[PDB]
Amino acid sequence: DDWRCARSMHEFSAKDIDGHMVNLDKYRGFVCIVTNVASQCGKTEVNYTQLVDLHARYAECGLRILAFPCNQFGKQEPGSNEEIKEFAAGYNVKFDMFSKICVNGDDAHPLWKWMKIQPKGKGILGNAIKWNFTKFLIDKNGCVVKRYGPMEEPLVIEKDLPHYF
């Protein structure tokens, strides 16, 4: 449980959707949106399309997006990593797709256990991720700066990006 004493997203690693181990310190210096995704939710389309739009408009200013598939919410991400990769490609995703994980419970990926206990990572009701497409905004130092619920369209994050983005 070394995740509990971490102070930055940059202290974690995660397998990408192709199986390559990513050291998240590669995001040092970048503003990041971290989100749990699913292919079989009613808002799947609006979330993917808006995240792609944010990335197209702000990648050159240093925005990065880390999408973590998760099957814990209505069994709405049942497919294999290869299937999910091809699904995201259908929305023209060019940001970073990760291998499927859990976000709640003791088996949750340590990055997610950590984000949920940060001062700005707590939800409106409590810490647990409530459904697909929760979003966390992470600053260039790897700290959580804001959390957005499943009903928040990604475009709501845009105003919270740095004023010179």
CSV table of C-alpha atoms in Angstrom, one decimal:
chain,number,residue,atom,x,y,z
A,1,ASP,CA,0.0,0.0,0.0
A,2,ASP,CA,2.7,2.5,-0.9
A,3,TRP,CA,0.1,4.4,-2.9
A,4,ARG,CA,-1.3,5.9,0.3
A,5,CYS,CA,1.8,8.0,0.9
A,6,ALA,CA,2.3,9.1,-2.7
A,7,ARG,CA,2.1,12.9,-3.4
A,8,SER,CA,1.7,13.0,-7.2
A,9,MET,CA,0.2,11.1,-10.1
A,10,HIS,CA,3.8,10.9,-11.3
A,11,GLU,CA,4.7,8.3,-8.7
A,12,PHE,CA,2.5,5.6,-10.4
A,13,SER,CA,2.8,3.3,-13.4
A,14,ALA,CA,0.0,1.7,-15.5
A,15,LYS,CA,-0.2,-0.8,-18.3
A,16,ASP,CA,-1.4,0.9,-21.6
A,17,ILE,CA,-4.0,-0.8,-23.8
A,18,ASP,CA,-1.2,-2.6,-25.7
A,19,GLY,CA,0.4,-4.0,-22.6
A,20,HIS,CA,3.3,-1.6,-22.4
A,21,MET,CA,4.1,-0.4,-18.9
A,22,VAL,CA,3.9,3.4,-18.8
A,23,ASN,CA,5.7,5.3,-16.0
A,24,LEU,CA,3.3,8.2,-15.4
A,25,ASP,CA,6.2,10.5,-14.7
A,26,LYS,CA,6.1,11.0,-18.4
A,27,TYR,CA,3.3,13.4,-17.7
A,28,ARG,CA,5.4,15.7,-15.6
A,29,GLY,CA,5.0,19.2,-17.0
A,30,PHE,CA,1.6,18.4,-18.6
A,31,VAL,CA,-2.0,19.1,-17.6
A,32,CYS,CA,-3.9,15.8,-17.7
A,33,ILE,CA,-7.5,14.6,-17.7
A,34,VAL,CA,-7.7,11.1,-16.2
A,35,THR,CA,-11.0,9.4,-16.8
A,36,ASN,CA,-12.6,5.9,-16.5
A,37,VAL,CA,-14.3,5.0,-19.8
A,38,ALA,CA,-16.8,2.4,-21.1
A,39,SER,CA,-18.2,1.4,-24.5
A,40,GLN,CA,-21.8,0.6,-23.6
A,41,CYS,CA,-23.1,3.6,-21.8
A,42,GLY,CA,-25.7,6.1,-23.1
A,43,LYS,CA,-23.1,9.0,-22.8
A,44,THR,CA,-20.2,7.0,-24.3
A,45,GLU,CA,-20.5,9.0,-27.6
A,46,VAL,CA,-20.6,12.5,-26.1
A,47,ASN,CA,-17.7,11.7,-23.7
A,48,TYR,CA,-15.4,10.3,-26.4
A,49,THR,CA,-16.2,12.9,-29.0
A,50,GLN,CA,-15.7,15.8,-26.5
A,51,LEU,CA,-12.4,14.3,-25.1
A,52,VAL,CA,-11.2,14.0,-28.7
A,53,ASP,CA,-12.1,17.6,-29.4
A,54,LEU,CA,-10.4,18.9,-26.2
A,55,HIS,CA,-7.3,16.9,-27.2
A,56,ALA,CA,-7.3,18.2,-30.7
A,57,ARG,CA,-7.6,21.8,-29.5
A,58,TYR,CA,-5.2,21.7,-26.5
A,59,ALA,CA,-2.6,19.0,-27.0
A,60,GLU,CA,-0.3,21.7,-28.4
A,61,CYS,CA,-0.6,23.6,-25.1
A,62,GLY,CA,0.3,20.5,-23.1
A,63,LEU,CA,-3.1,18.8,-22.5
A,64,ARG,CA,-2.9,15.0,-22.2
A,65,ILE,CA,-5.7,12.6,-21.6
A,66,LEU,CA,-5.4,9.2,-19.9
A,67,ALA,CA,-8.4,6.9,-20.4
A,68,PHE,CA,-8.9,3.8,-18.2
A,69,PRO,CA,-11.5,1.3,-19.3
A,70,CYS,CA,-13.5,-0.1,-16.4
A,71,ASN,CA,-16.3,-2.7,-16.3
A,72,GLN,CA,-17.5,-2.0,-12.8
A,73,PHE,CA,-20.6,0.1,-13.8
A,74,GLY,CA,-23.4,-1.8,-15.4
A,75,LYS,CA,-20.9,-4.2,-17.0
A,76,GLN,CA,-20.5,-1.6,-19.7
A,77,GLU,CA,-16.9,-2.4,-20.7
A,78,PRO,CA,-17.0,-6.2,-21.2
A,79,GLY,CA,-14.7,-6.4,-24.2
A,80,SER,CA,-11.1,-7.2,-24.5
A,81,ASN,CA,-8.3,-4.6,-24.5
A,82,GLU,CA,-7.9,-5.1,-28.3
A,83,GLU,CA,-11.7,-4.6,-28.8
A,84,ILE,CA,-11.6,-1.4,-26.7
A,85,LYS,CA,-8.6,-0.1,-28.6
A,86,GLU,CA,-10.5,-0.5,-31.9
A,87,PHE,CA,-13.6,1.1,-30.4
A,88,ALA,CA,-11.7,4.2,-29.3
A,89,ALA,CA,-10.1,4.4,-32.7
A,90,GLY,CA,-13.6,4.6,-34.2
A,91,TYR,CA,-13.9,8.0,-32.4
A,92,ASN,CA,-10.5,9.0,-33.7
A,93,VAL,CA,-8.9,8.9,-30.3
A,94,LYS,CA,-5.3,10.0,-30.4
A,95,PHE,CA,-4.8,10.4,-26.6
A,96,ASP,CA,-3.5,7.6,-24.3
A,97,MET,CA,-5.6,4.5,-23.8
A,98,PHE,CA,-4.8,2.2,-20.9
A,99,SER,CA,-5.6,-1.5,-20.1
A,100,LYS,CA,-8.9,-2.2,-18.4
A,101,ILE,CA,-8.8,-1.7,-14.6
A,102,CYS,CA,-10.9,-1.5,-11.5
A,103,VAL,CA,-11.5,1.9,-10.0
A,104,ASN,CA,-13.3,1.0,-6.7
A,105,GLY,CA,-12.6,-1.5,-4.0
A,106,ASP,CA,-9.4,-3.1,-2.8
A,107,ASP,CA,-8.4,-4.3,-6.3
A,108,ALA,CA,-8.6,-0.8,-7.8
A,109,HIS,CA,-5.6,0.5,-9.6
A,110,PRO,CA,-3.4,2.4,-7.0
A,111,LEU,CA,-3.6,5.6,-9.1
A,112,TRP,CA,-7.3,5.5,-8.6
A,113,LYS,CA,-7.2,4.7,-4.9
A,114,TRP,CA,-4.8,7.7,-4.6
A,115,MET,CA,-6.8,10.2,-6.7
A,116,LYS,CA,-10.0,9.5,-4.7
A,117,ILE,CA,-8.4,10.6,-1.4
A,118,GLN,CA,-6.8,13.9,-2.6
A,119,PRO,CA,-8.3,17.1,-1.2
A,120,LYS,CA,-9.8,18.0,-4.6
A,121,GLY,CA,-10.4,14.3,-5.6
A,122,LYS,CA,-13.4,13.7,-3.3
A,123,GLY,CA,-16.8,13.4,-4.9
A,124,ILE,CA,-20.0,15.2,-4.0
A,125,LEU,CA,-21.4,12.3,-2.0
A,126,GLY,CA,-18.1,10.6,-1.2
A,127,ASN,CA,-15.0,9.2,-2.6
A,128,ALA,CA,-16.2,6.2,-4.6
A,129,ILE,CA,-16.4,6.5,-8.4
A,130,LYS,CA,-20.1,6.6,-9.0
A,131,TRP,CA,-20.3,5.6,-12.7
A,132,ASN,CA,-18.5,5.6,-16.0
A,133,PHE,CA,-16.8,8.8,-17.2
A,134,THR,CA,-15.8,10.4,-14.0
A,135,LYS,CA,-12.9,12.8,-14.7
A,136,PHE,CA,-10.0,14.2,-12.7
A,137,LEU,CA,-8.0,17.2,-13.8
A,138,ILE,CA,-4.4,16.9,-12.8
A,139,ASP,CA,-1.9,19.8,-12.8
A,140,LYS,CA,1.6,19.8,-14.3
A,141,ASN,CA,3.0,18.6,-10.9
A,142,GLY,CA,0.7,15.6,-10.8
A,143,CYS,CA,-1.7,17.0,-8.2
A,144,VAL,CA,-5.5,16.6,-8.4
A,145,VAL,CA,-7.0,20.0,-9.0
A,146,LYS,CA,-10.7,19.1,-9.7
A,147,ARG,CA,-13.1,16.2,-10.0
A,148,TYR,CA,-16.0,16.0,-12.4
A,149,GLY,CA,-18.9,13.6,-12.1
A,150,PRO,CA,-20.3,11.2,-14.7
A,151,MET,CA,-22.9,13.7,-15.9
A,152,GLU,CA,-20.4,16.4,-16.6
A,153,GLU,CA,-19.7,16.7,-20.3
A,154,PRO,CA,-15.9,16.9,-20.9
A,155,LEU,CA,-16.3,20.4,-22.4
A,156,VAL,CA,-17.1,21.7,-18.9
A,157,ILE,CA,-13.5,21.0,-18.0
A,158,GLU,CA,-12.3,23.5,-20.7
A,159,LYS,CA,-12.8,26.6,-18.7
A,160,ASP,CA,-10.7,25.1,-15.8
A,161,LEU,CA,-7.7,24.7,-18.0
A,162,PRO,CA,-4.9,27.3,-17.6
A,163,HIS,CA,-5.8,30.8,-18.6
A,164,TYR,CA,-3.2,30.7,-21.4
A,165,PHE,CA,-4.4,27.4,-22.9
